[PDB]
Structures are given as structure tokens and as C-alpha cells.
Assembly symmetry: C2
Homo-oligomer: 270 residues x 2
């Protein structure tokens, strides 16, 4: 009675919150939780897999998009359950996640309602060979669904880091003439980067830039101004993923509701 | 070949940094790392221990002071190496750590050089039945070694949380008439709580209160003003500990140096 969790080496604090949920469901069901990290080296990846098989895990919960297909296949082929959390990793397996389009669309809805038209997505916005650019694509769809045009849509960044937020409006764009009035930050720390870059250059959020972040973890509460955020229920995602495994005997996608918490980082332009 | 790491369910971000160092050393030596979390429920602790025994781990690295003695004894009695990190858990086992007294005394030295006499320790300052009040005792020793008196020594708090920092100067002392000019925060988040409580009540750091934190993780760089801090080398603690396990052919304490990084959160009162 052991389940494994594969966590990327480089992660936001979302993982810890998911783990808290997994743990409370595992503990009350008589299972124990084995946590292992996954880097980008295919040979270390295979060792990690030998660790999962050797501890005879019943299930493996995947929190990383960098999981090689062969690991998913090999686990399934050993009759181990594989479930992905916060991401749709393979058509072969079930997933528990917040609904990405609904999250993004709720933010765009709100920003447009507050009078914003020129809006940037800042954070993980890159196109790649093997990973869907989920947030970039949803942002663009939502903006165009709202009858805005390419000229209103701005993008910056390759990851969810503080530094990406900070650099976006200092070296990515001209901080004195930002061409957008609002930024959607793909993670909380990106929002914190944006706040500090503005403050460090004689400007203030939200007067000079409105910000909404995705995740709603503790950084949004300790930021000043406090950050408006889409709060994900990471612990519920963890609980529901474990429950799915426990209740199992067709792959399924379960969407966990989110909510937009309004704090102090958005200005009404109307 | 597998090694375990036992992490408290409630932890600062220091654990991930330790684990980064453990991870790089385990990888290069052909071991795999299993991470497990420990609550304060003794039955759950025991179930976990059976997860360490039955994974036939070669070593267990302990990050938490809440480890029951029976767990350390049972692991040693099964010929498993046990090494504690950042804390001296038991006289029976080796430890790798920053030197606590030197960290504390480095801060007190500096604040006194900067003209401060009335100084608070804010954060984990409580006395208990089973756990040494390490920082409380070191602060008092260092202050008195510098020929300051009990009337110059102020203490607040029971843990390393943001909330403890925030409440210290709102419920703990009168924010308009603080009896100390500087606070030593026992973790970075406690410092951030102090900054926000001051700012939220119309005050300014460092003019109205000087702050120095212990740990020197990312929050100290994100804070405005940037926090003066004693930076611990958490990855190196992890690396050195794993290497101690790999080299073993009697219990020792290995101390890893720290550095006081002077930033923008301390006023020179001279
Ligand atoms: O941009 C979304 C994209 O990034 C990943 C991590 O690579 O998202 C994880 O991290 C985000 C920031 O903390 C979370 O908001 C998200 O829920 C989580 O999955 C990918 O998983 C995702 O496709
Ligand atoms: O106050 C020191 C005391 O607290 C513990 C945690 O209970 O310290 C850990 O967390 C601190 C704050 O992040 C770190 O500065 C410290 O290095 C780490 O050990 C105990 O271990 C320690 O005795």
C-alpha cells in the first residue's frame, strides 16, 4: 500500500499544496506516500522509474509535463495506475486539474469588464516542439472571443519565475511607455516580479499596471499591493486524484472549480 | 541503493534547497532519493518508518526536530545510517549544520556596530519541554556577552511564520512606541511579516525598525526594502551530508559557514 508522486525538480509551491491533499487522503486510506523528483536527464529518469517499480507502488501521480511517454507506458504495462494532476499528460490516463480555459477566460472577462483592452500574458508563454502552450493559446482564444485583435495582445516569457515577471516590463518592454494596461501573470511569483519592477522604477501597481495572477498561493497575500488572483484548489486536486485511484476497479478528466479573488492589484479604467 | 529524507509537513522553503544538494550528490553516486513527510501523529510516524525500513534505505536524512527517539533508535538498530541536517537531533548520530551561535552572534555584532542597543528576537522564541530553545538562548548569550542587559533584550513568538512577524508589532508591542530599534527575525518570512505590518500601519523600514533575518532565501531579495540576512548554504549542507554517508568506513558535527549579507533593512543609528 504505497503510492508514488513524481515532482519536477523546478517547481512553484503548488506541489507542496497538492501533496498536502494527497497525504490526507492516503493517510486515511491506509496508504503511504513516496515522493521522488524528476530532472531532465533521461538516464536519471529511468533510475527513478526503477525506484517506483521496486517499491511496488499501486499508483503514480504525475505533476510534471516533462514525463517521457515510455515511463507512462512502462508503468501502465506493470498494472500500476497513473494519474496526472494539474495537466493533461496523456490520452491514456485520467487527470485531475483546474479547467485552464475557464481560468483564463474568467481573468480576461474581468479585465475587460474593468475597462482594459491592451493586455499582456507574462510568464510561461513560449511555443515548443513537444509541450502544448496551454496558457498562451487560451489567452489568445479568450481575447479574440471578446472581439479584441492581435494589436491588443502582448506576450512575454519562458517560465513562471520572479525574474521573468521583473524582466518583462524592464527589458522586454519599455517601462515608461508600456503598450498594455494589464498583465496576466502565469504564476504568483511572476506577479511579484512585476510589482517590484514597477516599484523599483518609480511606478506603482495598479495605477501604472494592473495585474492578475494564476494560482493564489501565499505570495499573493504578502505582496503589496495584495494580488488579485485565480485561486486553484490544489489540495482538492490532490484529494480527488487519490479518490479516483481508490474508487477505480475509459480515462476521465475531472475539473476542479477555481475562483477569482479580487484584491488590490487591478484598476477600473472606465 | 536508496536513501530517505524525512521532511516535516510544516516547513520553511529551506528543505527544498537542502534536497537540491542531497539530490545532486545522490545522483552522481548512483543512489536514488525517497522523500517522505512526517506529521506529529505517532501512529502515522510509525507507518512511515515501516516505509523506510521496507524500502531498505541505506541512510535516512532528518530535517525535523520532532523525530521521536524510537525512530532514530529503530533505524540505527537496523544498521541504517541516520544523519540530521540543520539541527543536532541526537548525540548518537552525526549532523551537518550552520553553526547556530556564530549565526546569531554575527547579527548581534553587526546591529551593535550599527548603533542598536534595544533589540528583539522575533519568531521561534518559545521554551518547551522537549526541544532546545536554540535561538532564544543564543540571542540572550550574545547580547549579554556584548555587555547588554535584560532591559535591552526583547522576545516574541512561537514559530517561524509570516503571521508571527506580523503580530509581534501589532498585538505583541505598541507599533507607535516600539521599545526596540531592531528585530532579529528567526526566518525570512518572519521578516516579511514585520515589513508588511510596519508598512500597513504607515511606518517605514528601516527608519522605524531595523530588521535582519536568518536563512537568506529568495524572500529576502523580493522584500522591499531588501532584507539584510544571514545566508545559509542549504545545498552544501545536503551535499556534505550525503558525502559523509558515502565516505563512512563515530558521531561528528560538521559546520557549514554562513554570511551576513548587508542590504537595505538596517539603519545606522550612529
Ligand atoms: O503555464 C501552464 C503550464 O506550466 C505548468 C508547469 O510547467 O503549470 C504548473 O505550474 C503553474 C504555475 O505554478 C500552475 O499554475 C499549473 O497549475 C501547474 O500545472 C504546466 O503544468 C502547465 O501546462
Ligand atoms: O529556531 C531554530 C529552530 O527551528 C528549526 C525548525 O523548527 O529551524 C529550521 O528552520 C529555520 C527557519 O527556516 C532555519 O533557519 C533552520 O536552519 C532550520 O533548522 C530547528 O531546526 C531549529 O533548531
Amino acid at each position: 500500500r504505497v503510492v508514488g508522486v513524481v515532482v519536477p525538480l523546478i517547481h512553484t509551491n503548488f506541489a507542496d499544496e497538492i501533496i498536502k491533499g494527497l497525504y490526507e487522503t492516503t493517510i486515511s486510506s491506509g496508504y503511504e506516500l513516496l515522493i521522488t523528483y524528476l530532472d531532465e536527464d533521461e538516464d536519471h529518469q529511468y533510475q527513478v522509474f526503477q525506484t517506483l517499480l521496486s517499491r511496488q507502488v499501486g499508483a503514480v501521480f504525475m505533476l510534471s509535463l516533462d514525463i517521457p511517454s515510455w515511463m507512462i507506458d512502462k508503468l501502465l504495462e506493470e498494472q500500476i495506475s497513473v494519474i496526472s494532476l494539474t495537466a493533461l499528460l496523456s490520452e491514456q490516463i485520467s487527470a485531475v486539474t483546474s479547467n485552464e480555459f475557464e481560468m483564463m477566460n474568467s481573468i480576461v472577462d474581468y479585465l475587460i469588464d474593468m475597462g482594459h483592452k491592451n493586455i499582456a500574458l507574462v510568464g510561461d508563454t513560449k511555443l515548443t516542439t513537444n509541450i502544448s502552450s496551454t496558457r498562451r493559446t487560451n489567452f489568445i482564444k479568450s481575447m479574440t472571443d471578446h472581439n479584441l485583435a492581435y494589436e491588443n495582445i502582448f506576450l512575454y516569457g519562458n517560465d513562471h519565475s520572479y525574474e521573468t515577471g521583473y524582466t518583462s516590463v524592464t527589458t522586454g518592454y519599455d517601462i515608461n511607455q508600456l503598450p498594455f494596461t494589464a498583465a496576466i501573470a502565469t504564476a504568483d511569483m511572476v506577479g511579484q516580479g512585476l510589482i517590484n519592477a514597477m516599484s523599483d522604477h518609480g511606478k506603482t501597481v495598479p495605477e501604472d499596471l494592473s495585474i492578475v495572477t494564476i494560482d493564489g498561493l501565499q505570495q499573493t497575500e504578502i505582496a503589496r499591493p495584495k494580488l488579485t488572483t485565480v485561486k486553484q484548489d490544489f489540495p482538492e486536486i490532490g484529494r480527488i486524484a487519490m479518490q479516483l485511484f481508490l474508487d477505480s476497479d475509459e480515462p476521465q478528466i475531472i475539473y476542479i472549480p477555481t475562483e477569482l479573488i479580487q484584491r488590490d492589484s487591478v484598476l477600473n479604467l472606465n
